[PDB]
From a paper:
By testing six different protein samples, apoferritin (480 kDa), glutamate dehydrogenase (GDH) (334 kDa), catalase (240 kDa), influenza haemagglutinin (HA) trimer (190 kDa), aldolase (150 kDa) and haemoglobin (64 kDa), we show that the HFBI film can protect the specimen away from the air–water interface, solve the conventional severe particle orientation preference problem, improve the quality of the cryo-EM micrograph by forming thin enough ice, and produce high-resolution structures of small proteins with molecular weights as low as 48 kDa.
In the second case, we selected the influenza HA trimer as another specimen for testing. The pursuit of a very high-resolution structure of the influenza HA trimer by cryo-EM has suffered greatly from the strong preferential orientation effect with a majority top-view orientation, which was believed to be induced by the air–water interface. Here, we utilized the HFBI film-covered ANTA foil grid to prepare the cryo-vitrified HA trimer and observed a large portion of tilt and side views from raw cryo-EM micrographs, which was further assessed by 2D classification. We further analysed the particle orientation distribution and observed a nearly even distribution with the calculated cryo-EF value of 0.82, eliminating the previous strong preferential orientation effect using the conventional cryo-EM workflow. With the HFBI film, we determined the high-resolution cryo-EM structures of catalase and influenza HA trimer, both of which had a severe preferential orientation problem using the conventional cryo-vitrification protocol.
Residue numbers in the entry:
A (entry chain B), B (entry chain C), C (entry chain A): 9 to 325, 334 to 501
Write the structure that this text describes.
Amino acid sequence: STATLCLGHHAVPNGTLVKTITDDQIEVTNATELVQSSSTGKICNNPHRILDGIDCTLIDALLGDPHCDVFQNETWDLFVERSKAFSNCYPYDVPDYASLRSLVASSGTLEFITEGFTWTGVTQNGGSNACKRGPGSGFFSRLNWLTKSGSTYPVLNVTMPNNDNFDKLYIWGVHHPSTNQEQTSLYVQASGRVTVSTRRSQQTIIPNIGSRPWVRGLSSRISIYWTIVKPGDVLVINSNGNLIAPRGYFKMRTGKSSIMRSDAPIDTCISECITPNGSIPNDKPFQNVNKITYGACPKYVKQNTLKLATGMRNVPEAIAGFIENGWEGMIDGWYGFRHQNSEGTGQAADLKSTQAAIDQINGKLNRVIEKTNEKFHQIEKEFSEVEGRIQDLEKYVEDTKIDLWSYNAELLVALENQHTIDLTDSEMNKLFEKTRRQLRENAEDMGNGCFKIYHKCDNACIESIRNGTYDHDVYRDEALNNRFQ
Amino acid sequence: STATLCLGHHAVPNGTLVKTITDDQIEVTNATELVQSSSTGKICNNPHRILDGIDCTLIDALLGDPHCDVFQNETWDLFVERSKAFSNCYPYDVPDYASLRSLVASSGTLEFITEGFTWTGVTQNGGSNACKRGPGSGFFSRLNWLTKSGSTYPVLNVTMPNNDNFDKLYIWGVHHPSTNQEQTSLYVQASGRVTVSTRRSQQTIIPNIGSRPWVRGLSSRISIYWTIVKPGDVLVINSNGNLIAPRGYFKMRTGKSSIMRSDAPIDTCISECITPNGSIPNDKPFQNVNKITYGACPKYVKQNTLKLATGMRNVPEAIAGFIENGWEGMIDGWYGFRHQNSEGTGQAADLKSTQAAIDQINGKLNRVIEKTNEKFHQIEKEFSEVEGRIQDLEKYVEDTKIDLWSYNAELLVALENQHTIDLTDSEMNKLFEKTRRQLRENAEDMGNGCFKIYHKCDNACIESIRNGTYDHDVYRDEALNNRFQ
Amino acid sequence: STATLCLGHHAVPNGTLVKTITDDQIEVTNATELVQSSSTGKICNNPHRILDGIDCTLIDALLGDPHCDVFQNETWDLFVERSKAFSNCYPYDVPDYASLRSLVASSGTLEFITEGFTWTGVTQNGGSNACKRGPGSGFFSRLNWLTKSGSTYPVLNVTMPNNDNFDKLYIWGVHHPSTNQEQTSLYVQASGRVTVSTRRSQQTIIPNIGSRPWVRGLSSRISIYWTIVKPGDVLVINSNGNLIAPRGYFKMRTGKSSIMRSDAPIDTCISECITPNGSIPNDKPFQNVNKITYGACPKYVKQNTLKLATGMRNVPEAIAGFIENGWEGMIDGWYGFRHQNSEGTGQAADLKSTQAAIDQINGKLNRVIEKTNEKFHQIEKEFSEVEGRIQDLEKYVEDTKIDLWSYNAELLVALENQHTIDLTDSEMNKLFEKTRRQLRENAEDMGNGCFKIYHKCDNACIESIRNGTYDHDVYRDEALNNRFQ
Ligand SMILES: *[C@@H]1O[C@H](CO)[C@@H](O)[C@H](O)[C@H]1NC(C)=O
Ligand SMILES: *[C@@H]1O[C@H](CO)[C@@H](O)[C@H](O)[C@H]1NC(C)=O
Ligand SMILES: *[C@@H]1O[C@H](CO)[C@@H](O)[C@H](O)[C@H]1NC(C)=O
Ligand SMILES: *[C@@H]1O[C@H](CO)[C@@H](O)[C@H](O)[C@H]1NC(C)=O
Ligand SMILES: *[C@@H]1O[C@H](CO)[C@@H](O)[C@H](O)[C@H]1NC(C)=O
Ligand SMILES: *[C@@H]1O[C@H](CO)[C@@H](O)[C@H](O)[C@H]1NC(C)=O
Ligand SMILES: *[C@@H]1O[C@H](CO)[C@@H](O)[C@H](O)[C@H]1NC(C)=O
Ligand SMILES: *[C@@H]1O[C@H](CO)[C@@H](O)[C@H](O)[C@H]1NC(C)=O
Ligand SMILES: *[C@@H]1O[C@H](CO)[C@@H](O)[C@H](O)[C@H]1NC(C)=O
């Protein structure tokens, strides 16, 4: 008699469509989504130290807004700026505001050391009713509003050496009165001047005595400037008037700190990736949640979905083999044998080829993508004002990055799916070729992916063929007799 | 007797060389140029609304140059800025000119709403002989040149609330007189000041009273500034002098609008992609025409040609099959059979494998590159002045983008050509293996991509082999007798 | 009798692990490092014109520091800016210093043409003891310190037309005296003003009368500004006072020039690639030395090693063929035959398949990566100050470029290694299939990448099989008799 041993691969009834280099949409047994398209809606407070700016802007906490005194000496890995954040202090503008916000966020600390600045001949601790600290007028806690003492405002000329071994951030301000009457009343000089300089840098501000929109009852402003005094350098403040002096310096730092605009609530949970939408799992290589990211985050891509073939071609369902169709009834392994001999039909999965395919597919993605791009401080990617050239450059850089990484994701997923499908096909063909080699002249490929063994092949001989210990010479005579006679 | 059945693939005499991962220049039956290296030289006026700035710069049309009154209330999807554009009005400079040009181009409209600004104690509608609107002195139509009324220039202090639901762009200016005599004659104050501010922003400009190069007969200038008033915000203009006030505001839009410097004529034609060279077709995924693009444009690459293999190998031309040579004489399909039997030689293309290869090759490039990157406003990529850091950053960002996308194009073309070649080879080999399987023991492969069938194979039998309905058992006895006896 | 003919591939005892798309670490016979991870520590003075700024900053050489007069009229392709560079002249700051440094580096020349500027009513060649040119007081050699002549400082008003065909760079300065007494003594005007303008540009600077840190004995500063005068344009300098006028112009160039901050000594050596680490060989496509590069440099990648498989899979060691193991003892070629016949065992490498594999592998890398991205002037990539938005954008652009190119290198190496391994496997399989085709029915594949030929196969017959001139019909009768009888 003649037995019919042959090979096949597992098939699933519910396949999943993936995109390859050669096929637009090919069904495979298994696939995994490589894009994190959803977020939990909350920012995890671990492992990063998240500082929620409930009603406070980062610059508001920096200056010492009366409603931002809880953020004094605060440190963060990510400062979260809520859209409800508002200023309740003296109206102010920060020329080059974005740079100050960026560098204070990167510093990651509001640690403020008060310094013994000596202001002779002027009244310190000038307050306002726009800045109401308690039941009375106040001002920014980190800024000293100096005004004329008596009937004269001398030329303040103070020095502060940076004898420490770290950069000192001095946040000072220039008062812009609404009228010349206010300018003279606060500062006997009809036109003030504030030159804050270091041995290498310099910033001169001429106060602007002009009316402007009422903000919290004031048509005067404070223009906020910052001076970074590196170690060994010295800060000289020379003011003829309109000086909102610094009460000290902020300890600048370098690290993984940044700032995020987000309304996502902070939740007791752990996630190394934070987006304005909330924290997302970084298990997947790519995301479609937000281009704004903090921590170990997946690369942002424009694709909502990128399915990676983690299985083989799905060819759902006479024991014809892989060339005809896949085997739905085989669950022990990926590739296996079905045999029909005198002892009845049987099946047995091939563990060697199954494990080869599984091992090859296991780390396919993780070996072409670095562990995870861990980004902490970045450029601004959403803007509320129309700034122009610099904002356009930031938007263009981010769009270029997004387009290039989205193309990388598309090409990589197509390449990896093509390689997975070709690899599973090659494993099936390799097992078929091994079986053919074992069955040198004792079998014949029926053409449906199925061999026809021309000798009585009991289950023991089937097992011998399956495990590679099949000796063709034993049955060569009988097989040849049944084949060519 | 016996028969011959050789399997082959179509070949063309006029092959085309392509680049693959494995071969530097491999000849293929067909290839398509993937780089749009040429342009029609004229900008299509569809589907985008192209506004040709014949003799006007965008800022010239914005300010209301007398020779640019045809651009009043103008809208555009692309503003074309001719190199012959010139200014014929009061000489002016725009501090951060690039930013204003960028944001006005992005806004995409010159829609100007005149507002009831009230300037008390000053003479309005000041004009100069440099701006000759008609037979007399004129000025920018969108700017009001305020001067002293009689012998006094009071402290102008006006407000304009933004009660609408859109951003208001206020283009104002500061007059820079040639001499103190002119400053006092126009503005009794010896030193003017223009503070234009919102509840959040502020811009105070001190006029510069100094002579400078004559431009249209004037050594005075206008420094042009813009204020964007968001909805609910209020614009306050406080001028001690030298105020070139706004006559209103330009309504700000957000959309696909931009500006292009181009001398390409406008043509009654349709093209979704516009370059300074002119409109180019976006059928190809890459273009080597211009890095400056607008609309649904191909990605810019440094390659002047990237041929993508849309066919298979050429092995140009005893009927040996694919292993030996390609078949020049087969035009019906890509793969086919040539048979020699007692009834004479014949040929027949294999439609199944041909269609498989054609379908696999049809969308190879499409299923790895997004439809088309539709970019509307971008960074400036060509610069006429040496600005320095920001211009260097823009040039670096564009050069990095160009290099990365050029590498992407090289790698993609090489990968897709390698896959096309391997795919056509695999189709040929799969057809050969199918024919082998059908001819289990009836035929022997002669090594030239062909089979020697050892039984009388009439045209009906050859057709049965070709269509897969060949029964080996019918001729097994005769074939074995002719083979082994 | 019979014979054995096993096909195999060369193996090396010391393989090298490379990385593929399918295997994390696969041993190949040969691999080459694609990342230049090391530098010679010195800057080659060829082929680039390296100018070593020993103790001079580029701006120090530009202004004409007394200790930088050796750099007058100097030209360079790369200006090397040592960390020991110091200023020994009048203390100064350059508002927008980075832009001036960038544009002077891009120009690549300090060629200074002295111009006949006429300053009437002021004292020229003003000096200080901060700039000691010799034993007496000095000043910047390219700047004229103008002061009051006698007891009056008239309103300087000079013009300089650009009648040449090149851009003229005018480096001027504004004096910032420490006290009003110094301002009046040097400049009778209590408040100076310096307006330097062209027909299209304008820079007006108000001198800053305020004290500041002593630098070389002076609490006064020079604010350095530059004006680029296009051909046909004219430069007008007006000054009430505080004018550090230009003595001429620096001739602008466009080309391959740039500036590098490096302490690597310049050595008599040739290298087209320069890094702050020193010159590196550009033979490899990628580097891990420095993201800051000049000349034809390898792309910077984060990977310190990327091994590209320049050989085949290594399978180190009855003459079983390729299926079992690789051939350690075969050095003549890559693929070969080992035969056992009545005349004894022998071996012979296959030159055709070996050469096919070698030719395909030779240029795999260089037909997908452009020769060398020759980058000369680009953005600053290392910053000593915390500047903010623009510096953050530069850092983000460079980090994006580095990440994208590192992913490109990783994916490219994985793809090329996968293709090389599949290529060598396919060459071995193609040799096996050719040998099978030649031995139509005279040999049987034993399953170990080897054939049992069932006829007397002397060395001549084995050579005929190896060179493709083997006629199966000669031995078909004997082989069939030995096979099936
Ligand atoms: C902040 O830290 C400084 C550091 O010494 C300390 O002097 C100061 O009292 C602290 N203030 C607050 C509010 O924590
Ligand atoms: C201002 O202070 C600096 C150092 O703080 C000093 O060198 C200078 O003499 C002072 N000037 C006056 C006028 O006091
Ligand atoms: C995240 O937020 C942005 C902006 O609010 C929004 O455009 C995007 O759709 C959000 N994505 C998810 C997944 O919530
Ligand atoms: C522009 O539109 C406004 C809208 O009211 C109108 O008042 C004005 O006259 C228009 N100008 C032109 C030139 O069409
Ligand atoms: C200027 O106008 C603002 C409102 O526009 C007003 O609050 C302020 O009192 C005015 N100032 C003077 C001096 O009239
Ligand atoms: C397009 O124009 C640019 C600049 O004028 C030129 O460098 C380039 O060669 C042009 N290309 C084509 C295809 O016309
Ligand atoms: C620099 O070149 C100019 C060009 O004429 C020349 O006049 C000047 O003397 C040169 N100076 C030096 C120091 O070489
Ligand atoms: C200043 O010089 C310019 C030419 O450079 C001239 O047109 C103008 O009249 C001069 N002004 C005075 C006040 O001399
Ligand atoms: C090159 O120098 C940089 C900065 O000093 C350093 O981080 C890097 O490790 C150096 N690389 C080599 C190869 O010396």
